[model samples]
Target: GSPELRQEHQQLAQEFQQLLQEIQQLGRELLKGELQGIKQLREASEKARNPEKKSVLQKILEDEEKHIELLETLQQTGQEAQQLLQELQQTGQELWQLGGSGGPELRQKHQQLAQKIQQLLQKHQQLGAKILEDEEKHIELLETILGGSGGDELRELLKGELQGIKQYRELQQLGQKAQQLVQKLQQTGQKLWQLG
Candidate 1:
């Protein structure tokens, strides 16, 4: 017979699985959107008549392709991590059941599983950080390419690129903060489980 505590564990595992799926879905959408934007930029570059504007658009198109590739790689990593987390969650639930009502071995195994999840979370965060950094560099390159702007279009493009850099930096900070919180929680959980 499964204990009420076991039922709670099962529920939590299910929730984790659902959350992972949602995150993966969101990542796919984000990657697809970026790819579409790259296509639009390429088309705009091709249609542009002004040499300066055309040059900037062309460079942006190239950088955006690189960005798309990086994002696709990140998406793949995210999916892989999500799959691994689901497996770990299942293993944790099984250990919980096999230990049967709070044995020391069960507690130890839970701690180990928690640590693995923490590590995976950090890995994903680092990947996000790298993406953000690359985006910032890409934006900077665009700005440099558009420096000493000739027309309104060039100026507008520079303004948009600068705004992108600002937003990306904010995103990078958020990811870094989340990574720190995960590290802290992992440490606290390990200590508590050890004391138990």
Candidate 2:
């Protein structure tokens, strides 16, 4: 059971690391989607023949800024966000519609777009809420694994394993962060996500 605890630690650490990467990729892709939206707006605004149409486009652009779209044209989140951004740059259309001049026609088109956009934003908002829930679960799992005098056994185990890793000796002392290692690992994962 003690060794099993160590095993769980390593396993949790790995999954946690992947989770970190997973969220990072999501955020990056979402951001690229925003950039795509921005660039698209610039093009459409220039193409609009009337100031009214241009202003509508501008309003739509600002509306999306405060929300998440989770574009269908975005990265897989399991893959590279940078590559997704590159591909979108190659062949991606900004989400917009240009109907012929008529108040009702314009209203209909705008409403359709707005309806879909709101639905999408709601879905992504749920994702955000779920992610927060998952993070809380991770913290609870760590504490459960730690137990009373939690670090002692895991500490020695990690120390023995790190015997060959002489370079990190000065960094991770034996049993150091034994109970709170997840946070350290997550920080590293977040750094990787942000760097990309």
Candidate 3:
């Protein structure tokens, strides 16, 4: 009875760590891409007086600035994510340390930890999904700017923006799906535990 619990607990702990590590990498990539896009947009937007372009470039720069603000939020998001990962890591460490404690209290803690992991995974998924949606809006923002005669610099900015949005969204979506798989695995593991 006990060994089975330890084995399953260890397996779940290992899976959480691996999945968290992978998501951390992807989150960094997404943030990096967004930063690159902001730099490109800011540099170009600085090159002109927006109101001069029939407020077209004006609007573009305005919207671009807004997007930059949207990006500011991610720094906090990243920090929160880091904190979450650290907790996950810390908890996982304890999970493994339980190795084979035949204590009922410890077993209950194991079950609680497993459920919490799933909940937190979902928490990250929603945050990332919203970020992905923002990327789509960024794409549309680029599209709006594209329809106007902004300039050569604007074109370059647009290209970089497009690439950045693509990278940002892709990495986030990837993170989402991977964690989803992890969640499914948790379920499968539990189901087998019950049936076994």
Candidate 4:
């Protein structure tokens, strides 16, 4: 009975370790995305010809860099916590497999492991939320900058930018619609098969 339970627990622990690894990987990707955003902002700032608009773009670029740094810090913390959780899970599985007495000490270790996992999860969630907020702010600032005054030349540039945004949004919407259509077709086929 103990062996069976211990094996099941080990499997669960391994699954959790994999999940933590995936979360850390996602965090790294988010960090990379933030860094890319920072670069984009900087490039946009440099390309700006208007003195006032250039200043605004420069400010936005600085803010984007700050956001990127914040995300990098959060990602680092997440990666550290993920590693800690993996270690805890591995050690716990080993102890359980060894038939170590499931006494008060063992229970306490499990409790501590649970707490660490909870903390990691919470941190990951918070970081994700913050990243989303930063992205929203970044988009808002970009829109404001794009909306700034300009003559025909600047207007043409802004128009091109707006068209690019429109095309991007359209593509995204089209992709979603296509996915839904495919799902519906699959469901209809399944129903037809059942009927036949």
Candidate 5:
């Protein structure tokens, strides 16, 4: 019976769609950029004269591989969000037409839908932030590989000199990302063929 509720749902849906588009667009762009870097890094790894440099380049290549995985997940998340939005819109219309006639159970379902949408948005926002941060870290890694002191040796020296500073910081992040990859792999075991 309330026009304001419909208005609220409409506004929420619009924002949800906008967020989905932004994340999907960014994912596509970043995925392409990472793939390009991966190719160059792979060549550099092959040609590297020093074992340390070669190994470091290989690590970066692996990181970029993991990043591509994350980007694909982001795109899939966007699609899932799109489906959820459709469900919400349909439910909203159904409720509005029923007005006060709908049972408490239907209203409860609508509430759950709203909550799910909000939770999904929160996850999306966190993932978006992590994506940007990882991109920055990737650039830092590239600079270290291309311009810094002798590859992995310098990092080890810096590690000892700084007592767990810049080099180690990214290693920790990498470890966490490794865990994420493992979990994602377990969850999507069936889809491994796509990437393989």
Candidate 6:
């Protein structure tokens, strides 16, 4: 017989539907697409000679697998939520038809149902938060692996600098040797003139 509770139930139902859609989109786009690419990359990394790259790739692969499992659990929880919402709607409709005349027992039953609905909503919210949190983990790991290219670029830069320094030192040594030879020749020529 409570119009306000019924209204609140309807709003929650709508929001749950939206959340379900988001879960589906993430599973379809993010999980599926990445799984294939990640599998290939992981295999490539394993075959590569670089132990450093291989280890980071392994971490990504493991986390990606964990995320897939988490999403599956979230989807299962959503299914339970949907069933709960449907039962809640039925209870709300019966209460509305009875008006306030259902007395104390019916009112208590409705309160119990509302309580269960609230708990389910909380669980769903928490799962959604966790999925997003793990997504951030995935992104950070991805950046760390991809950023290896930057490391290679830096090594090349430093390598060139060292080579340039080596060449400069060799040139300085040759310049010193040439100056000593010229000084010796000038001294010899002065001795020859004196002898003349």
Best by TM-score: 5
> Which candidate wins on lDDT?
1
| Per-model lDDT | 0.58, 0.39, 0.57, 0.52, 0.54, 0.51
Clashing residue pairs found in predicted model 3: none
Candidate 5 residue spans exceeding 4 A from truth: 1-5, 145-196
lDDT of 3 by residue, 1-196 (tens): 5466546655755665575566566556655665666666556556656554334444554655554554455444444544655565565466456633555565455456556655655665565556556556655665655665646766776676667657666656655665665565466546544654
TM-score: model 6 vs. ground truth: 0.58
Candidate 4 structure quality by residue, lDDT tens digits, 74-133: 567657656766666665655545534445575456456556645655554565555455
Residue 14, candidate 6: Cα error in Å is: 4.4
Give Cα distance to truth, residue 115, candidate 3, Å. 2.4
Measured by C-alpha RMSD in angstroms, how accurate is candidate 2?
A: 27.6
Choose 2 or 4, whichever is better by TM-score: 4
- Supply candidate 4's per-residue lDDT for 56: 64
Each prediction's Cα RMSD? 5.5, 27.6, 4.7, 11.8, 13.0, 34.3
Error of 5 at 177 (Å): 25
Candidate 3: count of backbone clashes, pairs at least 3 residues apart or interchain: 0
Against the correct fold, how does model 5 do in TM-score?
Answer: 0.64
Ranking by lDDT: 1, 3, 5, 4, 6, 2
TM-score of 1: 0.61
How many angstroms is residue 180 displaced in model 3 relative to the true structure, after the best TM-score fit?
Answer: 2.9
lDDT of 5: 0.54
Query: Candidate 6 lDDT, tens digit per residue, 117-143?
Result: 455545645655565555455455545
TM-score rank order: 5, 3, 1, 4, 6, 2
Per-candidate TM equals 0.61, 0.32, 0.63, 0.61, 0.64, 0.58
Alpha carbon deviation, residue 80, candidate 3 (Å): 7.4
